[PDB]
Amino acid sequence: GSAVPFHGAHQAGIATPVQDRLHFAAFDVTTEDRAAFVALLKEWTAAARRLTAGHAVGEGAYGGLPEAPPDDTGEALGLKPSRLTLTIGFGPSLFTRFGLADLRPEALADLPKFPGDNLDRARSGGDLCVQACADDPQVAVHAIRNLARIGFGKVVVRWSQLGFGKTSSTTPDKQTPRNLLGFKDGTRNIAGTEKDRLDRFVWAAEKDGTPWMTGGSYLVARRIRMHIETWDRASLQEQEDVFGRDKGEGAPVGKAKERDEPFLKAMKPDAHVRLAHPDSNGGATLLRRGYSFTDGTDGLGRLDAGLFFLAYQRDIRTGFVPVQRNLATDALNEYIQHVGSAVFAVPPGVRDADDWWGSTLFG
Amino acid sequence: GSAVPFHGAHQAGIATPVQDRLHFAAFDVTTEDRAAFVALLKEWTAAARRLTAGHAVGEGAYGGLPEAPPDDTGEALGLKPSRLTLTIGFGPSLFTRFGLADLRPEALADLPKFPGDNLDRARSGGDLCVQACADDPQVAVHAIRNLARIGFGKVVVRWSQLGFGKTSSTTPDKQTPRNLLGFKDGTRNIAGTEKDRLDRFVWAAEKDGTPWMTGGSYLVARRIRMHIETWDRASLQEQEDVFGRDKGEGAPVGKAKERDEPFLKAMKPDAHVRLAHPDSNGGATLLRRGYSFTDGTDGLGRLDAGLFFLAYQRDIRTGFVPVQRNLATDALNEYIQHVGSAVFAVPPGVRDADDWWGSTLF
Ligand code: HEM
Ligand code: HEM
């Protein structure tokens, strides 16, 4: 459990084991030159091969010419690879550049406006994303800081989010993590072991209509604030009725164990699990891979905390869109607000040492 | 994942080995009722005994009356104590309430203005603080959230700071961590095992003039922004000349190993280590216990990066103040800006199960 292989038919960081920490960054492109952007994707891919093996970028962090800036900023020296994965994605706004408008996938759909949205434009969208996941947050931050530095003059950082899940040194791998509302989160999800369910619900197929995306996936990111101080004043019964599971064991109502299959008719009609379940959505099923956040306190002394929701799917129109539409009457809506949003096409994997991020799109 | 003992002559979270994560909160007091404030300190102490042992506060996180809110918010259920420490401090502004004016320690000094200061008043000061440190960020957030909930109507959060990784060491036997400039930070500190140096430089003594503070310490907090665009285009030689140590090993200039003693005359006259060293400051020595932070982007296309600097000392006048005055000509000033400040009196330890935070003052 020290490194995750970078090369594959698929990018790592989707179906590979969930790491303890997240640094997610969205970038905007500042160049109009296609050749200069392809050169960056090749340099970024070379850096990512070094970073995911626990090596410094370029000629290293020290021991070069004294009169040159070092190639690597040095804050990860002495740390382990920490299961780092680096996953790149392309936003809809990238396809307005470089003559790409006819290669935007139909599955990379713009999201509709949903009831109760309060999206901050500054923390939404982006031409590009890099998802950096690792067990050590300094390994993740060092990766984003050095990719941003390599890209300076061709890309800028639009927005950045730090996140946390479990701490693996102290918490067993099989234990479901709790979200900041104190409920177990992830019980009924697609697991990385389920190869057929990934082919059906997560990976883009050649016959889906966009050949360059074969073996890729589609990502939806939502920054969802929780109203923590309001939630903490709710009764135990009110909290359990919102979800349709009990708080201690996380069993479905009228069942005994966390992994018992739910009986949807025993839950309240607007309970979150009942509305989100595939049987309520024509079989629509998601891979959730999100992380908790706590950024600090706002001007009223309230905790700025919530869930940085990440979902992967074969098609945004048949995954996130139908399920989020069905949450229009969710009992949870009283306690949350969606304040950031973005969608990305995540290309296929880097096949070998000579391949590079985006090679199927750019040629 | 083990517990750090909560009781002692001193509070834990100072000499204790430095934990991976920080959640620091400053609170302002909103009650004028002395008895109501004393009742809060006792309830907070009872909660801290549970939290530091990995137990839920009050009657627990579930299995109570369905129609009542749970006593514990529940997001730490099934987690280990994770070396949680909870350290309380009292700000100078507290002493204007509850008839405490004559008990303000002389050693709790207001800081002067320093050249280059750009202090945000909203994220400075505070009537009191809680430093939560743990190896698990969820355990630290759970502690601050449950203390703030218990204090509803008597205290409000003024400002908070999360630290994602440590930039300090009280354990010279373990690897020294790096700050976001890529240098080891904590080589020449005070170790938790150096009992003589802790008595000389960190713990307040009865003869210092404030009996209620005997066994306590004084805390300076400084929020420091880093100019990483400016730093990352500097040459390797410029970076090493700024500090007086090499970047790869962290050895003093000319020497082979991190822990070899500095030879100050080989460093540039404005080198950070040369200006900050005790021999440059009449023997003034600090216990540094800070953490790195990043709070998103700056809105100008760049990552935000900084260091939340924490120093403990026996007297602010003989610790932080002379060292920071000597840093007026530091080469590092080109790459940093102080943007937040606070000082606190950290009372003595909770002696046993009948004692309570602040009992020697109140
Ligand atoms: C802060 C926001 C949210 C919280 C706190 C939350 C919490 C939970 C919890 C506690 C569960 C039950 C345990 C489990 O199976 O994971 C659950 C299930 C689920 N949630 Fe949410 N959720 C949130 C937002 C969303 C959103 C935005 C979507 C999709 C658009 C979503 C889709 C689901 C799905 C599909 C399930 C599994 C239902 C099943 O098949 O049984 N959730 N969520
Ligand atoms: C962003 C701000 C700062 C950075 C990046 C930084 C960095 C460093 C580094 C790399 C070292 C050498 C390794 C070590 O012995 O710890 C060091 C030493 C030291 N720093 Fe700083 N520092 C900063 C701010 C401060 C401040 C504000 C003070 C006190 C007012 C301070 C006091 C010291 C002391 C006392 C030493 C040890 C010198 C010795 O005895 O050898 N530092 N710092």
PDB file of N, CA and C in Angstrom, chain A residues 54-140:
ATOM      1  N   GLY A  54       7.100   9.218  -6.149  1.00  0.00           N
ATOM      2  CA  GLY A  54       7.781   9.835  -4.989  1.00  0.00           C
ATOM      3  C   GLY A  54       9.096  10.499  -5.374  1.00  0.00           C
ATOM      4  N   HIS A  55       9.340  10.782  -6.648  1.00  0.00           N
ATOM      5  CA  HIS A  55      10.540  11.510  -7.141  1.00  0.00           C
ATOM      6  C   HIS A  55      10.201  12.980  -7.390  1.00  0.00           C
ATOM      7  N   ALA A  56      11.207  13.824  -7.290  1.00  0.00           N
ATOM      8  CA  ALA A  56      11.119  15.259  -7.594  1.00  0.00           C
ATOM      9  C   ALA A  56      11.003  15.440  -9.113  1.00  0.00           C
ATOM     10  N   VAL A  57      10.400  16.559  -9.518  1.00  0.00           N
ATOM     11  CA  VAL A  57      10.229  16.894 -10.962  1.00  0.00           C
ATOM     12  C   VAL A  57      11.567  17.352 -11.567  1.00  0.00           C
ATOM     13  N   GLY A  58      11.709  17.177 -12.884  1.00  0.00           N
ATOM     14  CA  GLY A  58      12.887  17.679 -13.633  1.00  0.00           C
ATOM     15  C   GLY A  58      14.205  17.153 -13.060  1.00  0.00           C
ATOM     16  N   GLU A  59      15.221  17.999 -12.877  1.00  0.00           N
ATOM     17  CA  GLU A  59      16.568  17.649 -12.358  1.00  0.00           C
ATOM     18  C   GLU A  59      16.594  17.717 -10.825  1.00  0.00           C
ATOM     19  N   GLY A  60      15.459  17.977 -10.155  1.00  0.00           N
ATOM     20  CA  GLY A  60      15.336  17.811  -8.691  1.00  0.00           C
ATOM     21  C   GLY A  60      15.153  19.113  -7.920  1.00  0.00           C
ATOM     22  N   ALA A  61      15.196  19.031  -6.592  1.00  0.00           N
ATOM     23  CA  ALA A  61      14.912  20.135  -5.650  1.00  0.00           C
ATOM     24  C   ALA A  61      16.199  20.823  -5.147  1.00  0.00           C
ATOM     25  N   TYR A  62      17.357  20.203  -5.352  1.00  0.00           N
ATOM     26  CA  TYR A  62      18.654  20.806  -4.944  1.00  0.00           C
ATOM     27  C   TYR A  62      19.794  20.166  -5.764  1.00  0.00           C
ATOM     28  N   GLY A  63      21.025  20.676  -5.638  1.00  0.00           N
ATOM     29  CA  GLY A  63      22.208  20.075  -6.299  1.00  0.00           C
ATOM     30  C   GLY A  63      22.374  20.436  -7.762  1.00  0.00           C
ATOM     31  N   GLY A  64      21.564  21.339  -8.310  1.00  0.00           N
ATOM     32  CA  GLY A  64      21.787  21.898  -9.659  1.00  0.00           C
ATOM     33  C   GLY A  64      22.675  23.133  -9.610  1.00  0.00           C
ATOM     34  N   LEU A  65      22.750  23.881 -10.702  1.00  0.00           N
ATOM     35  CA  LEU A  65      23.503  25.163 -10.760  1.00  0.00           C
ATOM     36  C   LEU A  65      22.976  26.063  -9.647  1.00  0.00           C
ATOM     37  N   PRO A  66      23.847  26.639  -8.799  1.00  0.00           N
ATOM     38  CA  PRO A  66      23.404  27.557  -7.753  1.00  0.00           C
ATOM     39  C   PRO A  66      22.659  28.786  -8.277  1.00  0.00           C
ATOM     40  N   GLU A  67      22.961  29.248  -9.495  1.00  0.00           N
ATOM     41  CA  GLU A  67      22.359  30.497 -10.001  1.00  0.00           C
ATOM     42  C   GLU A  67      21.031  30.209 -10.721  1.00  0.00           C
ATOM     43  N   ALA A  68      20.523  28.982 -10.745  1.00  0.00           N
ATOM     44  CA  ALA A  68      19.199  28.673 -11.350  1.00  0.00           C
ATOM     45  C   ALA A  68      18.183  28.361 -10.251  1.00  0.00           C
ATOM     46  N   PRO A  69      16.896  28.690 -10.471  1.00  0.00           N
ATOM     47  CA  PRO A  69      15.845  28.220  -9.570  1.00  0.00           C
ATOM     48  C   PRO A  69      15.784  26.697  -9.627  1.00  0.00           C
ATOM     49  N   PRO A  70      15.528  25.990  -8.500  1.00  0.00           N
ATOM     50  CA  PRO A  70      15.392  24.540  -8.589  1.00  0.00           C
ATOM     51  C   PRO A  70      14.158  24.099  -9.403  1.00  0.00           C
ATOM     52  N   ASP A  71      14.247  22.948 -10.070  1.00  0.00           N
ATOM     53  CA  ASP A  71      13.157  22.393 -10.909  1.00  0.00           C
ATOM     54  C   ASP A  71      11.959  21.966 -10.046  1.00  0.00           C
ATOM     55  N   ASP A  72      12.196  21.504  -8.824  1.00  0.00           N
ATOM     56  CA  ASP A  72      11.164  21.056  -7.851  1.00  0.00           C
ATOM     57  C   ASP A  72      11.244  21.948  -6.601  1.00  0.00           C
ATOM     58  N   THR A  73      10.101  22.403  -6.074  1.00  0.00           N
ATOM     59  CA  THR A  73      10.025  23.384  -4.975  1.00  0.00           C
ATOM     60  C   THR A  73      10.420  22.754  -3.622  1.00  0.00           C
ATOM     61  N   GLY A  74      10.531  21.431  -3.517  1.00  0.00           N
ATOM     62  CA  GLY A  74      11.278  20.806  -2.407  1.00  0.00           C
ATOM     63  C   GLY A  74      10.457  20.425  -1.177  1.00  0.00           C
ATOM     64  N   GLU A  75       9.169  20.781  -1.036  1.00  0.00           N
ATOM     65  CA  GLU A  75       8.446  20.560   0.247  1.00  0.00           C
ATOM     66  C   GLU A  75       8.012  19.080   0.419  1.00  0.00           C
ATOM     67  N   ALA A  76       8.177  18.211  -0.587  1.00  0.00           N
ATOM     68  CA  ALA A  76       7.919  16.757  -0.454  1.00  0.00           C
ATOM     69  C   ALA A  76       9.200  15.923  -0.260  1.00  0.00           C
ATOM     70  N   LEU A  77      10.377  16.529  -0.128  1.00  0.00           N
ATOM     71  CA  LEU A  77      11.625  15.757   0.103  1.00  0.00           C
ATOM     72  C   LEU A  77      11.510  14.996   1.406  1.00  0.00           C
ATOM     73  N   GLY A  78      11.854  13.719   1.370  1.00  0.00           N
ATOM     74  CA  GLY A  78      11.763  12.860   2.563  1.00  0.00           C
ATOM     75  C   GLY A  78      10.399  12.215   2.779  1.00  0.00           C
ATOM     76  N   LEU A  79       9.381  12.506   1.967  1.00  0.00           N
ATOM     77  CA  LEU A  79       8.050  11.883   2.158  1.00  0.00           C
ATOM     78  C   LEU A  79       7.937  10.675   1.216  1.00  0.00           C
ATOM     79  N   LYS A  80       6.920   9.862   1.420  1.00  0.00           N
ATOM     80  CA  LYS A  80       6.719   8.619   0.628  1.00  0.00           C
ATOM     81  C   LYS A  80       5.790   8.955  -0.540  1.00  0.00           C
ATOM     82  N   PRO A  81       5.663   8.079  -1.563  1.00  0.00           N
ATOM     83  CA  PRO A  81       4.697   8.302  -2.643  1.00  0.00           C
ATOM     84  C   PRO A  81       3.279   8.502  -2.102  1.00  0.00           C
ATOM     85  N   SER A  82       2.946   7.846  -0.986  1.00  0.00           N
ATOM     86  CA  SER A  82       1.676   8.081  -0.260  1.00  0.00           C
ATOM     87  C   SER A  82       0.452   7.737  -1.132  1.00  0.00           C
ATOM     88  N   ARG A  83       0.530   6.734  -2.030  1.00  0.00           N
ATOM     89  CA  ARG A  83      -0.572   6.340  -2.941  1.00  0.00           C
ATOM     90  C   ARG A  83      -1.065   7.530  -3.787  1.00  0.00           C
ATOM     91  N   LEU A  84      -0.212   8.509  -4.080  1.00  0.00           N
ATOM     92  CA  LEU A  84      -0.615   9.662  -4.943  1.00  0.00           C
ATOM     93  C   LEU A  84      -1.154   9.161  -6.276  1.00  0.00           C
ATOM     94  N   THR A  85      -2.319   9.690  -6.664  1.00  0.00           N
ATOM     95  CA  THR A  85      -2.850   9.608  -8.033  1.00  0.00           C
ATOM     96  C   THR A  85      -3.134  11.025  -8.530  1.00  0.00           C
ATOM     97  N   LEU A  86      -2.906  11.232  -9.828  1.00  0.00           N
ATOM     98  CA  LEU A  86      -3.159  12.530 -10.509  1.00  0.00           C
ATOM     99  C   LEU A  86      -4.071  12.229 -11.690  1.00  0.00           C
ATOM    100  N   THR A  87      -5.259  12.813 -11.675  1.00  0.00           N
ATOM    101  CA  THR A  87      -6.321  12.537 -12.670  1.00  0.00           C
ATOM    102  C   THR A  87      -6.664  13.868 -13.341  1.00  0.00           C
ATOM    103  N   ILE A  88      -6.512  13.939 -14.656  1.00  0.00           N
ATOM    104  CA  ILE A  88      -6.817  15.181 -15.427  1.00  0.00           C
ATOM    105  C   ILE A  88      -8.190  15.080 -16.104  1.00  0.00           C
ATOM    106  N   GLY A  89      -8.860  16.236 -16.221  1.00  0.00           N
ATOM    107  CA  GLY A  89     -10.140  16.324 -16.935  1.00  0.00           C
ATOM    108  C   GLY A  89     -10.255  17.617 -17.719  1.00  0.00           C
ATOM    109  N   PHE A  90     -11.117  17.623 -18.730  1.00  0.00           N
ATOM    110  CA  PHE A  90     -11.304  18.769 -19.679  1.00  0.00           C
ATOM    111  C   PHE A  90     -12.738  19.297 -19.533  1.00  0.00           C
ATOM    112  N   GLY A  91     -12.869  20.592 -19.258  1.00  0.00           N
ATOM    113  CA  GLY A  91     -14.171  21.258 -19.093  1.00  0.00           C
ATOM    114  C   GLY A  91     -14.780  21.614 -20.428  1.00  0.00           C
ATOM    115  N   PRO A  92     -16.092  21.892 -20.452  1.00  0.00           N
ATOM    116  CA  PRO A  92     -16.728  22.295 -21.712  1.00  0.00           C
ATOM    117  C   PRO A  92     -16.102  23.521 -22.368  1.00  0.00           C
ATOM    118  N   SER A  93     -15.610  24.460 -21.559  1.00  0.00           N
ATOM    119  CA  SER A  93     -15.029  25.733 -22.053  1.00  0.00           C
ATOM    120  C   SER A  93     -13.696  25.496 -22.782  1.00  0.00           C
ATOM    121  N   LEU A  94     -12.987  24.392 -22.546  1.00  0.00           N
ATOM    122  CA  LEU A  94     -11.754  24.091 -23.310  1.00  0.00           C
ATOM    123  C   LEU A  94     -12.094  23.928 -24.798  1.00  0.00           C
ATOM    124  N   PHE A  95     -13.283  23.421 -25.135  1.00  0.00           N
ATOM    125  CA  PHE A  95     -13.608  23.016 -26.529  1.00  0.00           C
ATOM    126  C   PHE A  95     -13.949  24.254 -27.372  1.00  0.00           C
ATOM    127  N   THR A  96     -14.022  25.437 -26.782  1.00  0.00           N
ATOM    128  CA  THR A  96     -14.106  26.705 -27.557  1.00  0.00           C
ATOM    129  C   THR A  96     -12.719  27.156 -28.063  1.00  0.00           C
ATOM    130  N   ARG A  97     -11.612  26.521 -27.646  1.00  0.00           N
ATOM    131  CA  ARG A  97     -10.228  26.839 -28.080  1.00  0.00           C
ATOM    132  C   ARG A  97      -9.704  25.786 -29.044  1.00  0.00           C
ATOM    133  N   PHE A  98      -8.595  26.105 -29.719  1.00  0.00           N
ATOM    134  CA  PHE A  98      -7.763  25.138 -30.476  1.00  0.00           C
ATOM    135  C   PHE A  98      -8.559  24.410 -31.574  1.00  0.00           C
ATOM    136  N   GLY A  99      -9.697  24.931 -32.035  1.00  0.00           N
ATOM    137  CA  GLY A  99     -10.524  24.324 -33.103  1.00  0.00           C
ATOM    138  C   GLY A  99     -11.233  23.053 -32.674  1.00  0.00           C
ATOM    139  N   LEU A 100     -11.500  22.873 -31.377  1.00  0.00           N
ATOM    140  CA  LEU A 100     -12.023  21.585 -30.843  1.00  0.00           C
ATOM    141  C   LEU A 100     -13.560  21.533 -30.791  1.00  0.00           C
ATOM    142  N   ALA A 101     -14.300  22.539 -31.261  1.00  0.00           N
ATOM    143  CA  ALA A 101     -15.754  22.627 -30.969  1.00  0.00           C
ATOM    144  C   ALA A 101     -16.552  21.382 -31.414  1.00  0.00           C
ATOM    145  N   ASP A 102     -16.181  20.712 -32.502  1.00  0.00           N
ATOM    146  CA  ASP A 102     -16.906  19.517 -33.009  1.00  0.00           C
ATOM    147  C   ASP A 102     -16.448  18.227 -32.315  1.00  0.00           C
ATOM    148  N   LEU A 103     -15.509  18.286 -31.373  1.00  0.00           N
ATOM    149  CA  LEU A 103     -15.056  17.080 -30.639  1.00  0.00           C
ATOM    150  C   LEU A 103     -15.548  17.129 -29.192  1.00  0.00           C
ATOM    151  N   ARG A 104     -16.356  18.119 -28.793  1.00  0.00           N
ATOM    152  CA  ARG A 104     -16.999  18.052 -27.459  1.00  0.00           C
ATOM    153  C   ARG A 104     -17.951  16.858 -27.404  1.00  0.00           C
ATOM    154  N   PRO A 105     -17.827  15.941 -26.413  1.00  0.00           N
ATOM    155  CA  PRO A 105     -18.731  14.804 -26.319  1.00  0.00           C
ATOM    156  C   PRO A 105     -20.155  15.252 -25.947  1.00  0.00           C
ATOM    157  N   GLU A 106     -21.158  14.639 -26.571  1.00  0.00           N
ATOM    158  CA  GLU A 106     -22.559  14.889 -26.185  1.00  0.00           C
ATOM    159  C   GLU A 106     -22.784  14.505 -24.707  1.00  0.00           C
ATOM    160  N   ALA A 107     -22.070  13.510 -24.163  1.00  0.00           N
ATOM    161  CA  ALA A 107     -22.203  13.091 -22.748  1.00  0.00           C
ATOM    162  C   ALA A 107     -21.657  14.163 -21.778  1.00  0.00           C
ATOM    163  N   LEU A 108     -20.864  15.118 -22.258  1.00  0.00           N
ATOM    164  CA  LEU A 108     -20.356  16.239 -21.428  1.00  0.00           C
ATOM    165  C   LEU A 108     -21.408  17.352 -21.524  1.00  0.00           C
ATOM    166  N   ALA A 109     -22.521  17.131 -20.833  1.00  0.00           N
ATOM    167  CA  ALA A 109     -23.718  18.004 -20.870  1.00  0.00           C
ATOM    168  C   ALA A 109     -23.537  19.145 -19.869  1.00  0.00           C
ATOM    169  N   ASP A 110     -23.999  20.342 -20.226  1.00  0.00           N
ATOM    170  CA  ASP A 110     -24.147  21.445 -19.249  1.00  0.00           C
ATOM    171  C   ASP A 110     -25.231  21.050 -18.236  1.00  0.00           C
ATOM    172  N   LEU A 111     -25.018  21.352 -16.963  1.00  0.00           N
ATOM    173  CA  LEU A 111     -26.000  21.021 -15.908  1.00  0.00           C
ATOM    174  C   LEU A 111     -27.124  22.049 -15.995  1.00  0.00           C
ATOM    175  N   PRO A 112     -28.363  21.626 -15.790  1.00  0.00           N
ATOM    176  CA  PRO A 112     -29.432  22.597 -15.608  1.00  0.00           C
ATOM    177  C   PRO A 112     -29.299  23.285 -14.252  1.00  0.00           C
ATOM    178  N   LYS A 113     -30.071  24.348 -14.076  1.00  0.00           N
ATOM    179  CA  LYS A 113     -30.175  25.056 -12.787  1.00  0.00           C
ATOM    180  C   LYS A 113     -31.067  24.145 -11.942  1.00  0.00           C
ATOM    181  N   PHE A 114     -30.703  23.851 -10.703  1.00  0.00           N
ATOM    182  CA  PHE A 114     -31.537  23.017  -9.807  1.00  0.00           C
ATOM    183  C   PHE A 114     -32.102  23.928  -8.725  1.00  0.00           C
ATOM    184  N   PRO A 115     -33.302  23.606  -8.209  1.00  0.00           N
ATOM    185  CA  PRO A 115     -33.883  24.388  -7.111  1.00  0.00           C
ATOM    186  C   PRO A 115     -32.946  24.546  -5.909  1.00  0.00           C
ATOM    187  N   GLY A 116     -32.800  25.776  -5.422  1.00  0.00           N
ATOM    188  CA  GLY A 116     -31.987  26.099  -4.228  1.00  0.00           C
ATOM    189  C   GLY A 116     -30.484  26.278  -4.503  1.00  0.00           C
ATOM    190  N   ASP A 117     -30.028  26.109  -5.746  1.00  0.00           N
ATOM    191  CA  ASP A 117     -28.628  26.423  -6.172  1.00  0.00           C
ATOM    192  C   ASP A 117     -28.280  27.849  -5.726  1.00  0.00           C
ATOM    193  N   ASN A 118     -27.076  28.054  -5.234  1.00  0.00           N
ATOM    194  CA  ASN A 118     -26.487  29.387  -4.928  1.00  0.00           C
ATOM    195  C   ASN A 118     -25.003  29.313  -5.293  1.00  0.00           C
ATOM    196  N   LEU A 119     -24.744  29.197  -6.590  1.00  0.00           N
ATOM    197  CA  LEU A 119     -23.406  28.860  -7.106  1.00  0.00           C
ATOM    198  C   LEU A 119     -22.564  30.133  -7.126  1.00  0.00           C
ATOM    199  N   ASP A 120     -21.366  30.073  -6.547  1.00  0.00           N
ATOM    200  CA  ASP A 120     -20.358  31.154  -6.642  1.00  0.00           C
ATOM    201  C   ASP A 120     -19.622  30.970  -7.968  1.00  0.00           C
ATOM    202  N   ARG A 121     -19.728  31.948  -8.892  1.00  0.00           N
ATOM    203  CA  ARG A 121     -19.085  31.876 -10.234  1.00  0.00           C
ATOM    204  C   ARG A 121     -17.562  31.710 -10.097  1.00  0.00           C
ATOM    205  N   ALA A 122     -16.946  32.275  -9.071  1.00  0.00           N
ATOM    206  CA  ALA A 122     -15.480  32.251  -8.850  1.00  0.00           C
ATOM    207  C   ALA A 122     -15.025  30.843  -8.459  1.00  0.00           C
ATOM    208  N   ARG A 123     -15.900  30.034  -7.843  1.00  0.00           N
ATOM    209  CA  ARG A 123     -15.565  28.657  -7.402  1.00  0.00           C
ATOM    210  C   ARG A 123     -16.332  27.631  -8.235  1.00  0.00           C
ATOM    211  N   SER A 124     -16.667  27.960  -9.484  1.00  0.00           N
ATOM    212  CA  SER A 124     -17.382  27.086 -10.440  1.00  0.00           C
ATOM    213  C   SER A 124     -16.630  27.057 -11.778  1.00  0.00           C
ATOM    214  N   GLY A 125     -16.929  26.071 -12.602  1.00  0.00           N
ATOM    215  CA  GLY A 125     -16.337  25.915 -13.946  1.00  0.00           C
ATOM    216  C   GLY A 125     -14.841  25.654 -13.968  1.00  0.00           C
ATOM    217  N   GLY A 126     -14.217  26.000 -15.088  1.00  0.00           N
ATOM    218  CA  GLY A 126     -12.786  25.779 -15.332  1.00  0.00           C
ATOM    219  C   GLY A 126     -12.566  25.046 -16.626  1.00  0.00           C
ATOM    220  N   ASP A 127     -11.501  25.406 -17.337  1.00  0.00           N
ATOM    221  CA  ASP A 127     -11.125  24.758 -18.610  1.00  0.00           C
ATOM    222  C   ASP A 127     -10.590  23.344 -18.350  1.00  0.00           C
ATOM    223  N   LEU A 128      -9.920  23.121 -17.213  1.00  0.00           N
ATOM    224  CA  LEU A 128      -9.148  21.875 -16.888  1.00  0.00           C
ATOM    225  C   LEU A 128      -9.287  21.583 -15.389  1.00  0.00           C
ATOM    226  N   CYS A 129      -9.150  20.326 -14.970  1.00  0.00           N
ATOM    227  CA  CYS A 129      -8.977  19.995 -13.541  1.00  0.00           C
ATOM    228  C   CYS A 129      -7.825  19.015 -13.386  1.00  0.00           C
ATOM    229  N   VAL A 130      -7.207  19.064 -12.221  1.00  0.00           N
ATOM    230  CA  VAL A 130      -6.337  17.965 -11.709  1.00  0.00           C
ATOM    231  C   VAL A 130      -6.860  17.603 -10.325  1.00  0.00           C
ATOM    232  N   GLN A 131      -7.259  16.348 -10.172  1.00  0.00           N
ATOM    233  CA  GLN A 131      -7.603  15.719  -8.869  1.00  0.00           C
ATOM    234  C   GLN A 131      -6.326  15.047  -8.342  1.00  0.00           C
ATOM    235  N   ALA A 132      -5.771  15.526  -7.248  1.00  0.00           N
ATOM    236  CA  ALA A 132      -4.590  14.921  -6.606  1.00  0.00           C
ATOM    237  C   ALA A 132      -5.063  14.254  -5.316  1.00  0.00           C
ATOM    238  N   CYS A 133      -4.995  12.924  -5.240  1.00  0.00           N
ATOM    239  CA  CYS A 133      -5.393  12.204  -4.002  1.00  0.00           C
ATOM    240  C   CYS A 133      -4.147  11.523  -3.432  1.00  0.00           C
ATOM    241  N   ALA A 134      -3.974  11.560  -2.117  1.00  0.00           N
ATOM    242  CA  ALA A 134      -2.829  10.919  -1.451  1.00  0.00           C
ATOM    243  C   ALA A 134      -3.148  10.738   0.026  1.00  0.00           C
ATOM    244  N   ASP A 135      -2.352   9.941   0.724  1.00  0.00           N
ATOM    245  CA  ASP A 135      -2.600   9.743   2.170  1.00  0.00           C
ATOM    246  C   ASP A 135      -1.995  10.892   2.990  1.00  0.00           C
ATOM    247  N   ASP A 136      -1.081  11.641   2.442  1.00  0.00           N
ATOM    248  CA  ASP A 136      -0.364  12.755   3.113  1.00  0.00           C
ATOM    249  C   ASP A 136      -0.743  14.034   2.364  1.00  0.00           C
ATOM    250  N   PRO A 137      -1.359  15.029   3.015  1.00  0.00           N
ATOM    251  CA  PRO A 137      -1.813  16.202   2.310  1.00  0.00           C
ATOM    252  C   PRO A 137      -0.676  17.048   1.730  1.00  0.00           C
ATOM    253  N   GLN A 138       0.521  16.948   2.303  1.00  0.00           N
ATOM    254  CA  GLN A 138       1.651  17.730   1.771  1.00  0.00           C
ATOM    255  C   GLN A 138       2.100  17.131   0.454  1.00  0.00           C
ATOM    256  N   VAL A 139       1.939  15.835   0.245  1.00  0.00           N
ATOM    257  CA  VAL A 139       2.270  15.213  -1.070  1.00  0.00           C
ATOM    258  C   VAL A 139       1.301  15.727  -2.149  1.00  0.00           C
ATOM    259  N   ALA A 140       0.007  15.831  -1.827  1.00  0.00           N
ATOM    260  CA  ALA A 140      -1.031  16.312  -2.760  1.00  0.00           C
ATOM    261  C   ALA A 140      -0.792  17.795  -3.100  1.00  0.00           C
TER     262      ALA A 140
END
